[PDB]
Amino acid sequence: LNTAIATRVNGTPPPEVPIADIELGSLDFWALDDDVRDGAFATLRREAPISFWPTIELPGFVAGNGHWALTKYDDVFYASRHPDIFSSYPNITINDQTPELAEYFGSMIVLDDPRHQRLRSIVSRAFTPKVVARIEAAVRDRAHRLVSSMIANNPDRQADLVSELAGPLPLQIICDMMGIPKADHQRIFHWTNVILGFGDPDLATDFDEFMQVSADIGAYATALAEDRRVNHHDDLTSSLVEAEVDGERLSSREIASFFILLVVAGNETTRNAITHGVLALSRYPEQRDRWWSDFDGLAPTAVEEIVRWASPVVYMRRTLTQDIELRGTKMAAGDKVSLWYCSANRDESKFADPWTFDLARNPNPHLGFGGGGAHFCLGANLARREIRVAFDELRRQMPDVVATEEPARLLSQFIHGIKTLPVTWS
Numbered sequence: 001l002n003t004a005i006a007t008r009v010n011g012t013p014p015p016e017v018p019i020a021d022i023e024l025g026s027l028d029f030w031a032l033d034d035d036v037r038d039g040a041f042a043t044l045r046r047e048a049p050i051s052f053w054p055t056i057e058l059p060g061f062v063a064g065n066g067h068w069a070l071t072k073y074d075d076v077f078y079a080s081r082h083p084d085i086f087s088s089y090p091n092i093t094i095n096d097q098t099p100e101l102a103e104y105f106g107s108m109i110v111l112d113d114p115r116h117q118r119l120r121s122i123v124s125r126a127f128t129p130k131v132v133a134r135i136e137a138a139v140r141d142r143a144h145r146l147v148s149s150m151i152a153n154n155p156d157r158q159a160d161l162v163s164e165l166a167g168p169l170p171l172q173i174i175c176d177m178m179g180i181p182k183a184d185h186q187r188i189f190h191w192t193n194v195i196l197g198f199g200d201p202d203l204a205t206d207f208d209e210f211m212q213v214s215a216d217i218g219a220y221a222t223a224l225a226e227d228r229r230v231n232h233h234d235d236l237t238s239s240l241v242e243a244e245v246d247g248e249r250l251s252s253r254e255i256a257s258f259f260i261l262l263v264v265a266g267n268e269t270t271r272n273a274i275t276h277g278v279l280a281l282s283r284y285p286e287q288r289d290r291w292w293s294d295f296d297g298l299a300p301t302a303v304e305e306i307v308r309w310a311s312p313v314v315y316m317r318r319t320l321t322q323d324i325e326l327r328g329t330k331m332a333a334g335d336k337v338s339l340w341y342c343s344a345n346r347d348e349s350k351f352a353d354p355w356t357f358d359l360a361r362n363p364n365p366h367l368g369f370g371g372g373g374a375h376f377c378l379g380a381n382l383a384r385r386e387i388r389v390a391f392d393e394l395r396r397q398m399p400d401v402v403a404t405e406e407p408a409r410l411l412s413q414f415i416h417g418i419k420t421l422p423v424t425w426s
């Protein structure tokens with residue numbers, strides 16, 4: 001495969017970046033390549049581990065007040081485990097929501113306990129390890145077919161990993177858990193792609209399109225919920241419409257926001273873990289070889305290292321409910337605080353060799369699924385299984401699959417997205 005991308009020397013730290021060249025509040029910065037971004041967070045960890053940044057202006061989104069950026073692992077961990085101080089209300093991105101966004105985006109992820117946990121308990125059983133293990137057959141059937149179709153669909157042995165595997169595998173699994181008919185899965189995926197791609201001109205930059213997509217997926221959720229209210233199915237949509245929280249059924253807004261949260265999170269995270277993982281295997285072939293020659297033994301550590309390496313969710317935001325000082329920086333009640341998982345996951349204070357992609361890494365206390373605590377990723381067991389099966393099917397059917405171009409990278413501060421990744425195999 002002479003068209004494979006260049007390999008890299010594992011363990012090489014990126015050069016640190018002069019602090020004057022770092023603008024977290026500019027979309028231009030998020031367009032820099034990932035070596036520069038990684039070197040910039042390295043500078044912040046060293047020189048300004050907590051620092052303040054203006055919010056990025058996005059068309060039709062309210063920027064509002066700026067935010068305190070926590071770039072060190074210990075601070076991101078602390079903030080995550082202290083939700084009475086670091087609240088998830090009113091929003092978990094840096095920007096402000098509005099009443100009009102709240103119709104569609106006012107889910108449990110932007111609420112504190114106890115209401116957060118009462119909402120989460122409606123669906124939590126479906127995401128537990130023992131229940132998710134039950135659907136291995138479904139994950140395998142879909143992954144196996146997708147990889148086979150990459151082969152059958154491309155006589156030239158060239159494919160886009162994202163559209164042909166990494167995207168459609170998690171999409172199928174979450175949509176089927178929700179109870180969405182197959183004929184509408186791609187419609188769901190287009191809506192979630194726009195919702196968490198906004199600001200990249202390849203996805204959407206007109207706020208009117210963002211609002212029409214949001215209204216359209218909400219109307220879809222409401223219509224499916226209405227069907228399930230009358231005729232139950234064994235799906236999460238039926239669980240949502242049947243549940244009672246504080247003795248009251250969920251409202252239309254609550255059902256639509258819950259539905260949207262689950263399909264967005266399901267569709268716009270694992271795909272990037274998978275795609276960054278194939279990119280990493282392409283750059284570090286010794287790691288591919290060692291996983292391929294002991295797939296079951298290394299899989300638990302390998303999947304977690306892929307998540308640490310990719311950090312598919314770049315950050316989450318909190319809002320202080322009281323004044324607090326951290327690292328000698330006083331922050332005030334009401335201030336926004338951003339938790340940079342991408343940076344925690346390269347912190348030398350926690351990982352001695354953070355720049356080494358090591359599929360055997362153990363322990364691996366990465367914060368790719370967050371810092372732990374009340375909002376710890378509901379889908380973590382699901383995502384780990386999706387990743388493990390995707391790589392197993394690639395190993396079994398096309399073991400030498402390799403990237404042939406550098407990825408087209410999503411322009412986003414929030415999601416470490418890959419839009420396309422050309423691959424080949426022999």
Ligand code: HEM
Nearest residue numbers: 109262265266269270273312313369370375377378379383
């Ligand atoms: C590798 C893929 C994934 C990554 C990196 C990831 C990461 C995260 C992160 C960082 C959070 C915030 C945690 C916190 O605030 O402490 C989160 C929350 C969440 N994720 Fe995941 N996620 C992944 C896959 C999924 C999947 C497949 C689903 C399925 C629907 C999902 C559903 C959720 C939900 C519902 C929440 C909100 C939980 C709550 O507020 O209690 N995620 N995820």
Ligand SMILES: [Mg+2]
Nearest residue numbers: 154158159160
């Ligand atoms: Mg093609």
Ligand SMILES: [Mg+2]
Nearest residue numbers: 176179180181
């Ligand atoms: Mg079904």
